[PDB]
Nucleic acid binder design. Structure first.
Ligand SMILES: [Zn+2]
Ligand SMILES: [Zn+2]
Lengths: 148, 83, 109, 99, 85, 93, 99, 82, 94, 108
DNA sequence: ATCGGATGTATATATCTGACACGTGCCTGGAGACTAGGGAGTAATCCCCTTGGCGGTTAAAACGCGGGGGACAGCGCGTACGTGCGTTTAAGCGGTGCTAGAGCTGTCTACGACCAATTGAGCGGCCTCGGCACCGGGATTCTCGAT
DNA sequence: ATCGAGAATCCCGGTGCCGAGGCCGCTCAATTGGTCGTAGACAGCTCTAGCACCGCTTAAACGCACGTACGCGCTGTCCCCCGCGTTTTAACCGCCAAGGGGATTACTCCCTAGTCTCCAGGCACGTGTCAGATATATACATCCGAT
């Protein structure tokens, strides 16, 4: 199908050229389902961690956005523990030109710098504004006891 | 049960009578088709709004009130059928 | 007034003040309607009705009839200048038109 | 030898006749059929109250009478007594119906 | 003269261009891609999100969506892909 | 069944007040009912807009009077204002 | 020997010039005085905002320009190029302004 | 008090309005007719403006009164409020 | 300070920065656009109110707004306005 | 849609749903107002605004300008058929008129 | 300027039919009494902007003149429209039959108003730098008298 | 059919200024959470009137022919708008100065909504009779060809 053809090309581009600090693949037998994994960049308080995520492609694609969820938990204003993230790509600014590699790179960039303008979790952002040191130490300890 | 080319039922004598009531004395031969077109446009414009009004109320019959409301919306009030 | 008779009789009218008050209150016009608005509105409505009925009765008597049909209202409305200005865009069912013929159309002497 | 009127007197007689009466001037059944045809053009399987068709007829006939009055004035303005389609078009333009 | 196949490639569907349409922001994409985006998405540019609300109405009223000057070149110069696509 | 209110009895009362001899048909009664309803809607809507412009929340008698002045032509407006003022003055005492 | 334009070309030049611009065409002070005169006819000892006089001027100018468009069409209908008072009268009568 | 200020609407101003209207040749009796019709229009608008002002217990005819008066007669004006 | 007066200037500028990301707008033009928005709002709301009062209802739902849009707007503007509104409501509900 | 975000962004609009809801509630239109009416009205208003602004910007680009003035709005409204029919009785301040001359008046 | 036909329209009388005007039962909507609270009236204060004036410069208005092009009246042609008659068509009226759908009633559940605590979206005030207005000189192009 | 001179308009480059766009502080209006009363959604039943068919009169539509008078083009006269140059009037701009009245704030009281009870005004239905429409037979006004 046209969608299936889109995933086949994206597979070819992804396999011939891996992204930086990104891994992905098909979780199951079907070509619709996907899984991927990310790591905290060097200039991040979440360094050393490995984070898995699940991707589900709707029937209509790429016109409709794919569902993306986080299995684990991280200390970010945009993350929620249930697996939903605050990105404009997921619901509002979704575009058929965008690829899976592009959105994962965008997730990594969001991990690099917080955007507390539209935070799902209230209390994290205010701690970030008032005092950065407590934010940093809390993030460090939670990555130590949860990311590894 | 389709209906075709019923606008020819607006005959030439009827248009001459409508012109006579308006004070017209002499009529060219090409007036009738133009008048038929004008009447068709007016009827379509009114019936569209009447049908919209009757579709909103989840009904299947066009009542007199729908026609009166459509006429008043277009700017031509009609007295004697209610409202 | 005595504050004991019917409200229309208390104000000295024939149109209903209670129904006008209810229609003002339940008509989605304002949040809270005053107490003297229905009386004023009913008086205005009754005055206009009396005016039109008087003119139509004059026309009907001019036509040697003891009933008022829509034609006797069309004549009365169209002949009066101000009542015609008020009801300018109104169509009256079974009303006809006022008779006039352009002077150019009349026969040459 | 047979008696006939010069062209114009019978027309004036009819003008004086139809400005004194109040009945409708279009036959009822053809108008009803036309209304039903346009209605089925918009939405199919519609039923029509008789009062709806009567109101539509009254509105249409009043509109056409007014339009023909304006057309007569437009024809007279150009030193004429015959109404021609350009008069109808000018009257409809000035009224804003087509602009 | 003739552009290469790399730039004659639709990015929306990763396939050869068929009936290409070029938005006022100069982003070329397949006519089926455009129709699907208009029917389903938010009536904007899939690439840079430059909405064309009235452009689509104006051209569909006159049936001028297709960028014919490029469609003719694609069809004539590369007949192989067009027949199989 | 259903009860349908109308201004028919009051219009007949006014007719018998003006012309004690003339009657009225049914079509003329329908026309008079339509006219009364139409003028009611006109004046009430104008009064509502006047009250909303000035950031009031009441439709008092002066809102109705100004609406009458705005809608009705000259002598009609003067006579209507006089009649309404007389009725309101008689009602309050 | 002196240069002269044939009658009708400066008129078209003025038409092209005045349909490209957007500025007001009536002098501000005389219009303000006329507005004040009419107002003091209605109610005595009145005051006016500047925005009020400007709005009145804009409305009046737009109305007159539209009226002159209709008058031009009426004049052309009668096989002329001049506009005359009867053209204005016919346009206003058809528009329903004078009845 | 002011008297005969309708003559401030000069001949060239009416000619300019006609030129914008798309008129090529103008007769000589147009100007008085134009002054009359403009005066009628101004009277009609200003009467309602003053009525709106008097209802609000004011003494200056604001721009909103003029806008409402114009809108009452189907002459909606954009750019001054509303 | 002067009392606050609300307007649609911020949202109109936000919309303008989508169709033409390199075009500004004057102040008088913004006044005209704000007047246009207010006028169309009043038209649609009034038609919806009359529509609801005709059917002896008491609530203005999305259906009344849809029918009012169909009544007021011209032939081809309505077919797009209804689509935009239906899409917005469907996206907002779920 | 999921909650816990601004009420307009759920619908994807830029116009305010809450202000439209308040205006509908306090405007003396009806006794009660549904929950899905303000969203519909905001979407319609935003669509019309974008439709006018696009054509106005096109006219401004045609006139070598990078700023929209009332003349460009008048041009955009008058040239389009549907927008001209919708805004038919409306007057734009400082908008002028469209340039046309009757073919009879042109020199022969 | 008439006169007689000849046609059409208005006037006087019988009759008979169905719609108007009135009367009866009753039931729902309006009237009467009382309570609570917030909307609007009234007074006091601030300061914005509306009015009034003076001086100058200069763009626009008023006036006069010469002339050509458009408005307007008179003639002549012929073709399209009015009037009258015989014929063909479907409208109008009545009567009967059927059922689709408008209208009303009873249950009940979900949606929308109301209230209180809270905080961030959006408005008021400031500031600056680029887009647009203006000036000055040159290039391009319609216009008209003369061939 | 054209060539050329006078004149109006469009382009291009440089200078300046003010208002459009972005930022900061703040206060009030929209959001969230919880509760409750009722609007309307749905199912069932009645019975009203909208649709369809058939047969018979006769009224209105249709087609044809004859003739006339009105539309339309052409010519000619003349006078009244137009384009241009000169003088005169007052609009426009900038500045200063005063105070009228618009806009906001605080206090209070009285006018309107909400609730309960009750009863009579107006609405539906039934009945009689007379105002008006129709048929019929004269009287008079009006049109038209011919003196
Ligand atoms: Zn494609
Ligand atoms: Zn793009």
């Amino acid at each position: 199908h046209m969608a299936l053809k889109r995933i086949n090309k994206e597979l070819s581009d992804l396999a011939r050229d891996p992204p930086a600090q990104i891994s992905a693949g098909p979780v199951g037998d079907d070509m619709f389902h996907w899984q991927a994994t990310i790591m905290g960049p060097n200039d991040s308080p979440y360094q050393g961690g490995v984070f898995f995520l699940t991707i589900h492609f709707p029937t209509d694609y790429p016109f409709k956005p794919p569902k993306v969820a986080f299995t684990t938990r991280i200390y970010h204003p945009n993350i929620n523990s249930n697996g939903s993230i605050c990105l404009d790509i997921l619901r509002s600014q979704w575009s058929p030109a965008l690829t899976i590699s592009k959105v994962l790179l965008s997730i990594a960039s969001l991990l690099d710098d917080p955007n507390p303008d539209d935070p799902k979790v209230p209390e994290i952002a205010r701690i970030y504004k008032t005092d950065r040191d407590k934010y940093n130490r809390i993030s460090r300890e939670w990555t130590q006891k949860y990311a590894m | 049960k389709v209906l075709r080319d019923n606008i020819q039922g607006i005959t030439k004598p009827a248009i001459r009578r409508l012109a006579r009531r308006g004070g017209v004395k002499r009529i060219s031969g090409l007036i009738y088709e133009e008048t038929r077109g004008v009447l068709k446009v007016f009827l379509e414009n009114v019936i569209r709004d009447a049908v919209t009004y009757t579709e909103h109320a989840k009904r299947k019959t066009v009542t007199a009130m729908d026609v009166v409301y459509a006429l008043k919306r277009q700017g031509r009030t009609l007295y004697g059928f209610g409202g | 007034s005595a504050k004991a008779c019917t409200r229309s009789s208390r104000a000295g009218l024939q149109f209903p003040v209670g129904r006008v008050h209810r229609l003002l209150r339940k008509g989605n016009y304002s949040e809270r309607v005053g107490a003297g608005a229905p009386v004023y509105l009913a008086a205005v409505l009754e005055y206009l009705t009396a005016e039109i009925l008087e003119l139509a009765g004059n026309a009907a008597r001019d036509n040697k009839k003891t009933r008022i049909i829509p034609r006797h209202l069309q004549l009365a409305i169209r002949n009066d200048e101000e009542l015609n200005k008020l009801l300018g865009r109104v169509t009256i069912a079974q009303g006809g038109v006022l008779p006039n013929i352009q002077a150019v159309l009349l026969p040459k002497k | 030898k047979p008696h006939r009127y010069r062209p114009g007197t019978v027309a004036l007689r009819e003008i004086r006749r139809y400005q004194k009466s109040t009945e409708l001037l279009i036959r009822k059944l053809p108008f009803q059929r036309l209304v039903r045809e346009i209605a089925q053009d918009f939405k199919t399987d519609l039923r029509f109250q008789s009062s709806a068709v009567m109101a539509l007829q009254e509105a249409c006939e009043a509109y056409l009478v007014g339009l023909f009055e304006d057309t007569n004035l437009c024809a007279i303005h150009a030193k004429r007594v015959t109404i021609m389609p350009k008069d109808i078009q000018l009257a409809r333009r000035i009224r804003g119906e087509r602009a | 003269a003739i552009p290469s196949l790399s730039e004659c490639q639709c990015g929306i569907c990763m396939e050869i261009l068929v009936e290409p349409v070029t938005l006022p922001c100069n982003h070329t994409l397949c006519k089926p891609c455009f129709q699907s985006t208009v029917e389903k998405a938010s009536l904007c540019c899939p690439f840079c999100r430059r909405r064309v609300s009235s452009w689509t109405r104006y051209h569909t009223r006159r049936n001028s969506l297709v960028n014919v000057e490029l469609w003719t070149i694609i069809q004539k110069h590369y007949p192989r892909e067009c027949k199989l696509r | 069944r259903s009860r349908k209110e109308s201004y028919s009895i009051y219009v007949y009362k006014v007719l018998k007040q003006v012309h004690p001899d003339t009657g009225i048909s049914s079509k003329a009664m329908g026309i008079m009912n339509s006219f009364v309803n139409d003028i009611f809607e006109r004046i009430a809507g104008e009064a509502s807009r006047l009250a909303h412009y000035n950031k009031r929340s009441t439709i008092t008698s002066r809102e109705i009077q100004t609406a009458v002045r705005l809608l009705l032509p000259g002598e009609l407006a003067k006579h209507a204002v006089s009649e309404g003022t007389k009725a309101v003055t008689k009602y309050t005492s």
